[PDB]
Each structure stands twice: as structure tokens, then as C-alpha cells.
PDB file of C-alpha atoms and ligand atoms in Angstrom:
ATOM      1  CA  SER A   1      -0.285  -0.564   0.179  1.00 11.27           C
ATOM      2  CA  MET A   2       0.788   3.916  -0.245  1.00  9.77           C
ATOM      3  CA  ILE A   3       2.868   5.513   2.523  1.00  7.97           C
ATOM      4  CA  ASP A   4       1.323   8.145   4.549  1.00  8.69           C
ATOM      5  CA  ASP A   5       3.495  11.557   5.341  1.00 11.51           C
ATOM      6  CA  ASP A   6       4.448   9.853   8.637  1.00 11.97           C
ATOM      7  CA  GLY A   7       5.940   7.184   6.562  1.00 13.71           C
ATOM      8  CA  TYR A   8       3.419   4.555   7.976  1.00 14.95           C
ATOM      9  CA  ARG A   9       2.180   2.586   5.897  1.00 16.14           C
ATOM     10  CA  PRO A  10      -1.875   1.622   6.544  1.00 16.39           C
ATOM     11  CA  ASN A  11      -2.237  -2.306   7.482  1.00 19.35           C
ATOM     12  CA  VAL A  12      -4.917  -4.655   8.809  1.00 18.44           C
ATOM     13  CA  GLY A  13      -4.097  -7.063  11.024  1.00 18.88           C
ATOM     14  CA  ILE A  14      -6.070 -10.460  11.847  1.00 17.16           C
ATOM     15  CA  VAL A  15      -6.606 -12.724  14.814  1.00 16.53           C
ATOM     16  CA  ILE A  16      -8.564 -15.142  14.588  1.00 13.39           C
ATOM     17  CA  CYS A  17      -9.646 -17.846  17.109  1.00 13.41           C
ATOM     18  CA  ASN A  18     -11.367 -21.136  17.779  1.00 16.57           C
ATOM     19  CA  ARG A  19     -13.745 -22.136  20.939  1.00 15.49           C
ATOM     20  CA  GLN A  20     -11.057 -24.035  22.519  1.00 13.24           C
ATOM     21  CA  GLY A  21      -8.947 -20.200  23.804  1.00 10.08           C
ATOM     22  CA  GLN A  22      -7.015 -21.078  20.811  1.00 10.89           C
ATOM     23  CA  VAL A  23      -5.560 -18.797  17.792  1.00 10.44           C
ATOM     24  CA  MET A  24      -4.248 -18.955  14.436  1.00  9.93           C
ATOM     25  CA  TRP A  25      -0.575 -18.858  14.547  1.00  9.84           C
ATOM     26  CA  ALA A  26       1.370 -19.047  11.112  1.00  9.51           C
ATOM     27  CA  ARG A  27       4.725 -19.104  10.317  1.00  9.52           C
ATOM     28  CA  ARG A  28       7.033 -16.399   8.111  1.00 11.66           C
ATOM     29  CA  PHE A  29       7.454 -18.414   4.620  1.00  9.47           C
ATOM     30  CA  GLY A  30      11.039 -19.381   4.780  1.00 11.33           C
ATOM     31  CA  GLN A  31      12.071 -18.445   8.711  1.00 13.17           C
ATOM     32  CA  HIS A  32      11.547 -19.739  12.100  1.00 13.44           C
ATOM     33  CA  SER A  33       9.539 -16.485  13.253  1.00 11.07           C
ATOM     34  CA  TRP A  34       5.651 -16.530  13.628  1.00 11.41           C
ATOM     35  CA  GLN A  35       2.716 -14.071  13.481  1.00 12.72           C
ATOM     36  CA  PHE A  36      -0.901 -12.898  13.165  1.00 10.95           C
ATOM     37  CA  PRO A  37      -1.523 -11.973   9.788  1.00 11.56           C
ATOM     38  CA  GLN A  38      -1.420  -8.867   7.927  1.00 11.41           C
ATOM     39  CA  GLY A  39      -2.181  -6.694   4.992  1.00 11.85           C
ATOM     40  CA  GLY A  40      -1.556  -3.237   3.278  1.00 11.68           C
ATOM     41  CA  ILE A  41      -4.947  -1.409   2.247  1.00 10.78           C
ATOM     42  CA  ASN A  42      -4.838  -0.606  -0.983  1.00  4.92           C
ATOM     43  CA  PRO A  43      -6.646   3.331  -2.032  1.00  2.89           C
ATOM     44  CA  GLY A  44     -10.365   3.409  -2.251  1.00  3.47           C
ATOM     45  CA  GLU A  45     -10.306  -0.127   0.113  1.00  2.00           C
ATOM     46  CA  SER A  46     -11.830  -0.108   3.725  1.00  2.00           C
ATOM     47  CA  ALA A  47     -10.003  -1.395   6.406  1.00  2.00           C
ATOM     48  CA  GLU A  48     -12.720  -4.164   6.712  1.00  2.00           C
ATOM     49  CA  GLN A  49     -12.321  -4.318   2.908  1.00  2.00           C
ATOM     50  CA  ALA A  50      -8.069  -5.004   3.333  1.00  2.00           C
ATOM     51  CA  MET A  51      -8.883  -7.732   5.787  1.00  2.00           C
ATOM     52  CA  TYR A  52     -10.864 -10.008   3.896  1.00  2.00           C
ATOM     53  CA  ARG A  53      -8.873  -9.205   1.212  1.00  2.00           C
ATOM     54  CA  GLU A  54      -5.622 -10.650   3.466  1.00  2.00           C
ATOM     55  CA  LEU A  55      -7.824 -13.292   4.832  1.00  2.00           C
ATOM     56  CA  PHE A  56      -8.348 -15.059   1.453  1.00  2.00           C
ATOM     57  CA  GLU A  57      -5.037 -14.175  -0.154  1.00  2.00           C
ATOM     58  CA  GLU A  58      -3.109 -15.659   2.039  1.00  2.00           C
ATOM     59  CA  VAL A  59      -5.319 -17.759   4.832  1.00  2.00           C
ATOM     60  CA  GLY A  60      -7.621 -18.656   1.823  1.00  2.00           C
ATOM     61  CA  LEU A  61     -11.107 -18.000   3.594  1.00  2.00           C
ATOM     62  CA  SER A  62     -14.229 -16.292   2.866  1.00  2.00           C
ATOM     63  CA  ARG A  63     -16.134 -14.008   5.079  1.00  2.00           C
ATOM     64  CA  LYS A  64     -18.951 -17.102   5.058  1.00  2.00           C
ATOM     65  CA  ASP A  65     -15.943 -19.139   6.623  1.00  2.00           C
ATOM     66  CA  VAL A  66     -15.483 -16.704   9.942  1.00  2.00           C
ATOM     67  CA  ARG A  67     -17.445 -13.907  11.901  1.00  2.00           C
ATOM     68  CA  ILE A  68     -16.299 -10.705  13.070  1.00  2.00           C
ATOM     69  CA  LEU A  69     -16.183 -10.538  16.406  1.00  2.00           C
ATOM     70  CA  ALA A  70     -14.184  -7.298  17.792  1.00  2.00           C
ATOM     71  CA  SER A  71     -12.580  -4.658  16.120  1.00  2.00           C
ATOM     72  CA  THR A  72      -9.486  -2.617  17.474  1.00  2.00           C
ATOM     73  CA  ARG A  73     -11.215   1.294  17.278  1.00  2.00           C
ATOM     74  CA  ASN A  74      -8.211   3.413  15.897  1.00  2.00           C
ATOM     75  CA  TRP A  75      -4.368   3.338  14.717  1.00  2.00           C
ATOM     76  CA  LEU A  76      -1.705   1.205  16.330  1.00  2.00           C
ATOM     77  CA  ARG A  77       1.479   1.854  15.131  1.00  2.00           C
ATOM     78  CA  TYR A  78       4.682  -0.183  15.625  1.00  2.00           C
ATOM     79  CA  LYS A  79       8.636   1.619  12.760  1.00  2.00           C
ATOM     80  CA  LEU A  80      10.819  -1.215  11.723  1.00  2.00           C
ATOM     81  CA  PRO A  81      14.437  -1.141  13.715  1.00  2.00           C
ATOM     82  CA  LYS A  82      16.804   1.163  11.811  1.00  2.00           C
ATOM     83  CA  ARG A  83      18.049  -2.247   9.949  1.00  2.00           C
ATOM     84  CA  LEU A  84      15.472  -2.977   8.322  1.00  2.00           C
ATOM     85  CA  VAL A  85      14.331   0.462   6.835  1.00  2.00           C
ATOM     86  CA  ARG A  86      14.952  -0.088   2.956  1.00  2.00           C
ATOM     87  CA  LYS A  87      11.537   6.922  -2.212  1.00  2.00           C
ATOM     88  CA  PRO A  88       8.997   7.546  -0.281  1.00  2.00           C
ATOM     89  CA  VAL A  89      10.309   5.352   2.558  1.00  2.00           C
ATOM     90  CA  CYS A  90       8.479   2.831   5.208  1.00  2.00           C
ATOM     91  CA  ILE A  91       9.422   3.275   8.628  1.00  2.00           C
ATOM     92  CA  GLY A  92       5.975   1.354   9.846  1.00  2.00           C
ATOM     93  CA  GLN A  93       3.359   0.269  10.452  1.00  2.00           C
ATOM     94  CA  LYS A  94      -0.251   1.925  10.818  1.00  2.00           C
ATOM     95  CA  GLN A  95      -2.342  -1.062  12.501  1.00  2.00           C
ATOM     96  CA  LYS A  96      -6.332  -2.036  12.342  1.00  2.00           C
ATOM     97  CA  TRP A  97      -7.561  -5.038  13.697  1.00  2.00           C
ATOM     98  CA  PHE A  98      -9.876  -7.817  13.837  1.00  2.00           C
ATOM     99  CA  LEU A  99     -10.600 -10.428  15.893  1.00  2.00           C
ATOM    100  CA  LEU A 100     -12.312 -13.134  13.306  1.00  2.00           C
ATOM    101  CA  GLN A 101     -14.175 -16.662  14.936  1.00  2.00           C
ATOM    102  CA  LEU A 102     -13.221 -19.852  12.360  1.00  2.00           C
ATOM    103  CA  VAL A 103     -16.608 -21.151  11.911  1.00  2.00           C
ATOM    104  CA  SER A 104     -16.353 -23.642   9.235  1.00  2.00           C
ATOM    105  CA  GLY A 105     -13.265 -26.714   9.386  1.00  2.00           C
ATOM    106  CA  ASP A 106      -9.766 -26.070   9.922  1.00  2.00           C
ATOM    107  CA  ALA A 107      -9.212 -28.089   5.979  1.00  2.00           C
ATOM    108  CA  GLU A 108     -10.802 -24.161   4.910  1.00  2.00           C
ATOM    109  CA  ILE A 109      -7.447 -22.536   5.480  1.00  2.00           C
ATOM    110  CA  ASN A 110      -5.286 -22.575   2.721  1.00  2.00           C
ATOM    111  CA  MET A 111      -2.354 -20.591   3.108  1.00  2.00           C
ATOM    112  CA  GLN A 112      -0.611 -22.002  -0.343  1.00  2.00           C
ATOM    113  CA  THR A 113      -2.292 -20.064  -3.214  1.00  2.00           C
ATOM    114  CA  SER A 114       0.259 -17.215  -3.703  1.00  2.00           C
ATOM    115  CA  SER A 115       2.853 -17.568  -5.852  1.00  2.00           C
ATOM    116  CA  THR A 116       5.038 -16.484  -3.342  1.00  2.00           C
ATOM    117  CA  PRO A 117       2.824 -16.788   0.106  1.00  2.00           C
ATOM    118  CA  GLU A 118       3.169 -15.108   3.342  1.00  2.00           C
ATOM    119  CA  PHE A 119       3.545 -18.217   5.597  1.00  2.00           C
ATOM    120  CA  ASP A 120       4.230 -21.800   5.075  1.00  2.00           C
ATOM    121  CA  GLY A 121       1.527 -22.840   7.541  1.00  2.00           C
ATOM    122  CA  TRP A 122       0.108 -22.382  10.284  1.00  2.00           C
ATOM    123  CA  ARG A 123      -1.182 -23.553  13.821  1.00  2.00           C
ATOM    124  CA  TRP A 124      -3.454 -23.386  16.949  1.00  2.00           C
ATOM    125  CA  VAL A 125      -1.597 -21.831  19.866  1.00  2.00           C
ATOM    126  CA  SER A 126      -2.578 -20.111  23.421  1.00  2.00           C
ATOM    127  CA  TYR A 127      -4.568 -17.363  23.670  1.00  2.00           C
ATOM    128  CA  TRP A 128      -1.671 -14.564  25.296  1.00  2.00           C
ATOM    129  CA  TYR A 129       1.541 -17.006  23.239  1.00  2.00           C
ATOM    130  CA  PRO A 130       1.511 -15.476  20.508  1.00  2.00           C
ATOM    131  CA  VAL A 131       2.923 -11.815  22.747  1.00  2.00           C
ATOM    132  CA  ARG A 132       6.284 -13.375  23.824  1.00  2.00           C
ATOM    133  CA  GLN A 133       6.849 -14.978  20.610  1.00  2.00           C
ATOM    134  CA  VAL A 134       6.456 -12.294  18.098  1.00  2.00           C
ATOM    135  CA  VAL A 135       9.472 -10.408  16.830  1.00  2.00           C
ATOM    136  CA  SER A 136      10.228  -7.595  19.817  1.00  2.00           C
ATOM    137  CA  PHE A 137       9.053  -4.707  17.390  1.00  2.00           C
ATOM    138  CA  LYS A 138       5.641  -5.600  17.255  1.00  2.00           C
ATOM    139  CA  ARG A 139       5.381  -6.659  20.653  1.00  2.00           C
ATOM    140  CA  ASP A 140       3.887  -3.865  22.424  1.00  2.00           C
ATOM    141  CA  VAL A 141       0.885  -3.618  19.156  1.00  2.00           C
ATOM    142  CA  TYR A 142       0.815  -7.173  20.232  1.00  2.00           C
ATOM    143  CA  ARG A 143       0.508  -6.891  23.560  1.00  2.00           C
ATOM    144  CA  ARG A 144      -2.802  -3.566  23.462  1.00  2.00           C
ATOM    145  CA  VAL A 145      -4.209  -6.069  20.845  1.00  2.00           C
ATOM    146  CA  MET A 146      -4.602  -9.232  22.889  1.00  2.00           C
ATOM    147  CA  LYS A 147      -5.538  -6.979  25.906  1.00  2.00           C
ATOM    148  CA  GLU A 148      -8.544  -5.838  23.936  1.00  2.00           C
ATOM    149  CA  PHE A 149      -9.415  -8.983  22.560  1.00  2.00           C
ATOM    150  CA  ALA A 150      -9.135 -10.531  25.910  1.00  2.00           C
ATOM    151  CA  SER A 151     -12.742 -10.615  27.060  1.00  2.00           C
ATOM    152  CA  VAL A 152     -14.637 -12.175  24.163  1.00  2.00           C
ATOM    153  CA  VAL A 153     -12.017 -14.933  23.069  1.00  2.00           C
ATOM    154  CA  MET A 154     -11.905 -16.164  26.599  1.00  2.00           C
ATOM    155  CA  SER A 155     -16.285 -15.930  26.508  1.00  2.00           C
ATOM    156  CA  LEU A 156     -15.769 -18.704  23.808  1.00  2.00           C
ATOM    157  CA  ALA A 157     -13.587 -21.014  25.407  1.00  2.00           C
ATOM    158  CA  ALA A 158     -15.689 -21.295  28.642  1.00  2.00           C
TER     159      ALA A 158
HETATM  160 MG1  LIG B 201       0.645  -9.816   4.729  1.00  2.00          MG
HETATM  161 MG1  LIG B 202      -0.729  -9.888   2.062  1.00  2.00          MG
END
């Protein structure tokens, strides 16, 4: 997507949960680092539309396979380490986050449809596992996201 005048790229992130107090955790393509799905917002796209596009592209899912349970109100920002900053220059992402419950079967997820996948694949992890496990520069954002979505996911686990 197009970079704003502050160097931040508008971005959507996706936390997909089940009814067992678990969230979908995905392995970055060709790496041993893991994250939640995230993607850019195209010009003319709403955040929700961008979310469903990134859901289709890299998780293989339809609106019909999920239900939106929550979203974050404003932008959550992270800055890249100086080493990872590659005209115009992107220094980080400003993110809107969505909590989805997977209602279709696990077999509906397909992370291998792109010629260059974001992810190798995924597994279910315990709810709080992502906070300690994501790359450190995203940890502050992840902590806030997971805190905001906490009450909803724990209700399904009961
Ligand atoms: Mg992505
Ligand atoms: Mg993507």
C-alpha cells in the first residue's frame, strides 16, 4: 500500500480464534519467526475490505468462513528497526486489528495459494503465546491487541 506523510503504511491485522481459547499462529514463509496475518490497505479500500482481501489471499478464507467478533478503534503503530528500513520510505505500519472466529472447518484454511506465500502454514496456539513469541518490535502492538480482544475469546473458551 501507499505510505503516508509520516512514513507509516496503513495496515490490517487478523487474530483468528476458535472455541478452545486458541488463536491461529502462522509461520513466516521460509523463516522460524511467527506472526498473525497482516496486509496493506489499497487506495479506495476500507479496513474491513482490506482485511477480507488479506484473509482470502493468505488464509484462503471467505467472509462465510468467519464472523467478526471485534476490532480495534484507532491506529496502532509500530516502527521498523533502522536496519530493516529499505522514495517514499516506509518506517513502519499503522494498523487496524480484527478479531475473527473461525466457523468453518480447519481444512478450509489454505496458506499456499500465492506464488510467494506470506506463510508456510499455521497452528493453533494458546491465547497469550503470541505476545512473547512475535518479533520484539511488534510486541507492544501485540500486547495491546491481545489485551483488547481477551474478554471475547475467553467467553468462547468457557
Ligand atoms: Mg501480509
Ligand atoms: Mg499480504
